[PDB]
A = this chain, B = another copy of it.
Amino acid sequence: ADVAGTSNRDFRGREQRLFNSEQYNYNNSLNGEVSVWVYAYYSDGSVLVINKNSQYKVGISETFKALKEYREGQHNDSYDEYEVNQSIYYPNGGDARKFHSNAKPRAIQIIFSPSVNVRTIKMAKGNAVSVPDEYLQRSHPWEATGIKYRKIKRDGEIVGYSHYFELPHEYNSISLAVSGVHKNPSSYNVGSAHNVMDVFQSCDLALRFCNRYWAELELVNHYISPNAYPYLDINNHSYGVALSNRQ
């Protein structure tokens, strides 16, 4: 047989490259996943991740209370935190024993998989009572924030999209919903009558994941990297695996 890495007859080499290219392209086909991640960063260094994976379109919607830090099997000032919530929903509404709850997110990172169309991204960043823009009556239910998404790149390939905003001020008390549509460069409308019921089933079939990791290191090591997910850490380092035309 020919010697490895010396000719066009390195079929193991050609198959390895097609294996990777097929994974990348399958993800971008209409048969592929579109994924979103919401990272809620807490002052104790811990991170709540919410992931949703689904065909055609995907989104996450969380209340103000849902995004607050929750330590499973540990104490969480549960009564005082009810009182904190009352004071966030209306100024001087509660009877809490603290000025600032360390359970409030300090920042949010939204990440989409590379199969999303960035022009379809929408976000409903509401106040603590889940109103998008001060009062319902003058509220547009979303903002198309695609222009703000940074490309997460590895070896010159886009492995994801990231929108990051800090919540460092006392008044940064939010409810949050985000949505993205899978790329579709064809003229076959996935929601037209022929396929609309598959999109309705996709709403049933979407898989969700939620967990609080103790640190960004732990998130990078045990969540991001093992699953070949894209990520952008605090030092602006990009994580992911480049697959198109690669061995």
Contacts and interface: CB of A to CB of B under 8 A. Distances in A.
A241 to B, nearest CB: 8
Contacts of A80: 73
Contacts of A203: 59, 200, 203
Q: How large is the interface on A (under 10, 10 to 19, 20 to 34, 35 or more residues)?
A: 35 or more
B44 A102 contact: yes
A58 interface: yes
Contacts of A99: 44-46, 214-215, 217
Given A130-B51, A136-B113, A138-B23, A63 B210 contact: yes
Contact of A137 (B129, B199, B228): B228
Interface string A25-57: 011000111010000000111100001011111
A93 interface: yes
A14 interface: no
A207 interface: yes
Interface string A95-117: 00111111000000000010000
B54 A207 contact: no
A208 interface: yes
Interface string A199-238: 1111111111111001101000011001111000000000
Interface of A: 22-24, 26-27, 31-33, 35, 43-46, 51, 53-61, 63-65, 72-75, 77-82, 85-86, 89-90, 93, 97-102, 113, 120, 122, 124, 126, 129-132, 135-142, 175, 177-179, 181, 189-193, 196-197, 199-211, 214-215, 217, 222-223, 226-229, 243
Given A44-B98, A99-B217, A196-B196, 7 more contacts: A23-B138, A46-B98, A59-B203, A74-B79, A130-B208, A136-B229, A199-B200
